[PDB]
Symmetry: C3
Subunit: 105 residues, 3 copies
């Protein structure tokens, strides 16, 4: 039983199975921790005004116990239609890209 | 050992256990990939102005290697109080709903 | 086989291994459900205007089949530079913090 809490070794091949599963779960949670932190940072922008010019959006964020840096840019044309798109950098292999559009009803 | 990398079969019933766990993990990660993509797309809006009318917010996004479509709408009354709410459609069984409010301090 | 669907018990110690893994997966998905709901709620704000004052941002959200409450606040100085930062409360042990900045290009 390894030390006490873990206790991966179970059978002739249960130790490798338990370790593999435990490693996969930790990897999923990690991607969500950093992935959410970066995504939020990007979704935390909104471009300050924009009657017909370009605006730079960027910022950092954090989730649970992780941190990520997100960036982006969009062009705010007129006061009726809009558009925003940027990329977020989380951890190492956790990258995401956004692209939405705002409109007045 | 299946092919080489996988190697699900372990014992008399380890093959089914390893496959079930591997399938569950992949399903969790998937929901996060599309779920985050859609959520972000919705959170990437902000409604262009709004002194006392309605605004339509919609857009698409992507995370890691997935894509989702999000939509929403809110009424921007006055220049002090606000409100935004919309729904996001990710994958197939990945739907989320938002509803927040902005205020000037 | 427990009841039918579950069927955790497999070997002399497979029941405990299957239960532990199944419990971990459910815990990961949970953190993502509430974590995404709260994060979105916070990222669903944008501060209504701000030429040189403070703005309070807060709201709730939901993902899949969960609900969370998020809050935050930032100071909107001038009509070129900006900043937003807040904290989101999800479930019980699912807390996140954001902090980004907007700028006109």
């Amino acid at each position: 039983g390894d030390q006490a809490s873990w206790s991966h070794p179970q059978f002739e091949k249960g130790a490798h199975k338990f370790r593999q599963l435990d490693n996969r779960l930790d990897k999923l949670d990690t991607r969500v921790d950093k992935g959410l932190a970066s995504s939020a940072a990007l979704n935390s922008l909104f471009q300050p005004y924009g009657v017909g010019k370009v605006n730079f959006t960027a910022g950092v964020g954090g989730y649970r116990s992780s941190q990520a840096l997100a960036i982006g840019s969009g062009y705010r044309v007129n006061e009726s239609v809009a558009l925003k798109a940027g990329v977020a950098y989380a951890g190492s292999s956790d990258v995401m890209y956004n692209a939405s559009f705002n409109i007045e009803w």
